[PDB]
Amino acid sequence: MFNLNTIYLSRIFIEFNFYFLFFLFLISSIIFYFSKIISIQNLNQNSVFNFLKLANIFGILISFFIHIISFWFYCIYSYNLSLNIFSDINLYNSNSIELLNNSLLPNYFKSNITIDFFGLILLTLAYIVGFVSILALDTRLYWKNIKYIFSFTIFLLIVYVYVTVSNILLFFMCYELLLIPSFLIVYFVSPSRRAIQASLYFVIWTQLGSLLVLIAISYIISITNTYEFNDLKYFNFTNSESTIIIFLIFLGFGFKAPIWPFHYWLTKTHVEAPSGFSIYLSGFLVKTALYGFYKFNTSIFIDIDSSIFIAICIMGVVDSSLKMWGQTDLKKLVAYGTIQEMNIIYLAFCWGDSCAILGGILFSATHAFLSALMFFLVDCIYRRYHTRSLVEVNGILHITPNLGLSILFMLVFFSGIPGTIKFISEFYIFSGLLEASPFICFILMLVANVLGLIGFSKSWFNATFGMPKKNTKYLPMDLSFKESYIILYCFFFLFIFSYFSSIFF
Template sequence: MNSTPLFYYQDILFYTSLIPLIGILLLVFISSEQQKLLKVVALNFSSLPFLIFLCIWGAFKKSVGTFQFVTTLLWIPVINLNINLGIDGISLFFLLLTTLLIPLCILISWNSINSNLKGYLISFLIIEFFLIGVFCVLDLLMFYIFFESILIPMFLVVGIWGSRERKMLASYYFFLYTLLGSVVMLLSILYIYNQVGTTDYEILLTFVFSDFEQKILWFTFFLAFAAKVPMMPVHLWLPEAHVEAPTAGSVILAGVLLKLGTYGFIRFSLPLFPQASFYFTPFVYTISLLGIVYASLTAIRQTDFKRIIAYTSVAHMNVVMLGIFSFNNVGIEGAILQSLSHGFVASALFVIIGVVYERYRTRLVKYYGGLVHTMPLYISVFLFFTMANIGFPGTSGFIGEFLIFAGSFKVNSSITFFGATGMILGGCYALWLFNRIAYGNLKSQYIKQTLDLNKREVFIFVPLICYTLILGLTPDICLNSIHMSVNNLVENMYF
């Protein structure tokens, strides 16, 4: 293990993870009537981890493929259970994505959430704490605890602050679909602990399970991670949750929570059960291709703005699965890059929906049209992220998709062909949606306001635009840090 002190604190990851909890403690003692102070405190304490992880990125050793900034905290020493924290090139950028989007979620809700504001802000700080834990923890049992704990605050965000009458049903959909698969994974973790005597991730990497054990364990982990991606047929919760969730809830769902599934496959399924991963590859390819085509065709016939983007998320995350199961550096690095790109682009698209929903209180596409005449800045941002969503060269979406298909082509050219065909459908529905919203006659009987983007909304979009362009124009800024970790992962799978 390689430990790199930062600011003379070896336990920097542990202290950083506590920052959202300190923010929660302060919010508890602030009066609910002081809404501006509540927002400022929550925004500052959610932003501070992002700044720290930027510094960690600067101190990160790109030439090292093992975990860095490693910390071990005693938990239950009697039964050999400890809390191990550490990051590598794979988890670093998911942490940066998470800690960027959480403060943006608070900014998104600055004016739209007034009822029980304190509980709302606390929920997002709890989500940030659990997400930091998911991407930092190097213990299988602790990963499961953080992985499942996120369900509780997200259930509350959708169920309490959702925008429509079906919000409770949507929150139960989300909770049950993602919980049921994970319960089976818990049983597998108990079996692993019984066999190995520990759930320490780095020790598990050195343990070799039999082929039969690998197949059973892989499939139980698959049930948990597939629901988060989501893959067919356990994707039904996602459109419902997106449609009913507040804008910030949709942003964190699409931006980070969908990445828990792909991260789980990369971090646990591939290195711990390599033979089973090879064995089930045709199964994964089949479901992924069905998901790409089905979600793309379904998106075309939707009438709700949010539901369209929700189905595009299903299609894009299934493309990521093709890259993960290419089992080579190019495909896996492309999958990581595409996951990050989707985090920025899908989040921005949901913010774009939230902007017009705050003004006109509807998400039905038929009520919009001709917004280019009244909201030119808004339409310019919408066009940029539409191009990024369909993988236009120069944006992060293009680099991620190109690397995924380049990696999968080495394994199976037919799969690459059908996967790329599905993405062509994505271009159809994305451009058609933009055309219906931006052009045509202005429907003045519905659209009576002409307010374009305000300063707060511009401030939200600027970092998302910058990171989309940076990843698209200079992907090496991320790939250089990711490469050694992915190379180490691939080598462990084959040898």
């Protein structure tokens, strides 16, 4: 019963949501530039900053709704396309349906849009995490950094082109564009003075991996003059070229997606970055690397043993889990948790295009939401209690019961209770790893889910419980409606996404 109307509606929605975002950004930027001689806030109720905040927030939100609709259309379209290809067995019949483009808006960068489930999951993560982070950064943007209210819109446009393109070069360029806005945010919006050095560490560490990926892309392009991302089927790389490409790709994308030993920059940046931008970084900016690694390694044929890469990922997991205990800083502890989860996700991609990719994608989504939740809780603690250190913070539950309850439920979700996409992703990865290498699976599970979990829980429980006798004149009140509903939405997603259609998982 599938008809061409659904196909064209899917394509039109995907194409036009990008232009909706772009036109919103363009209008907002034109207003901002041409309303004032100097593009800084006027400290009065009639400033354009209020309009810009409104436009950014409710462009992201409306584009997120349209993205939900377009993602559902894509799911139907992909399912029915697979059915059309698979169903017919007659040799004379073949599915050759050709679509003509609309005459209203042009194709951005003269590229035909191609959408995949992983790309749309990444785009949904971008939308939601960007919404949370923009909601967080309101107190940070003041009177000279208001120009960074558009950072998340720029991120959304970059990610949209990144996930809706079938061109290798455009793919790589979109991946590399993410550096400038993130560096500028960390440099100009971070309150702490150590953020200045943290930004440089972030730039250099990420750029080393960017150069590695650039070398790999140069190898692919120079050898294969193609750029369509599908002509690689008709060209085979020799053993030496293939091993060089996989090594470069893995190391370069692991610089971004933190792997052992390349997580020093991540720890520094998470500790010294804005509490609202740490959410976006951990939640989304480390998963574009995973998506790019998946695309490249599934496109290239590799005839090498992945034991070395699996060992690197497992070593990162073990290192982060063991170090969890020794952190009294909640933000650094959450950063180590992010490193652990990202290393597990990266390990999920070490078997080419096997079924491990499904667990990897689900784990990427759950880690995004869980890291957003954890960093937002740390943000609330730091903002109301003027410290994010375990020695200075104690007995949160008895003065701010809602915040303590949020911490406890965050710990329960992090533990991986059944009924959560966290548990589902752990089940996928461990079920595969048990047959792949059962002893390695046992070691990984033991370390991560006992030693790292206990180290993680020690600090959070100590902060939540106790007796806050110190500085009774300065104790805060409670979570606000904004914070409470953000926490509730994170919990709601982590719980209900387990009912998403199992066809794609």
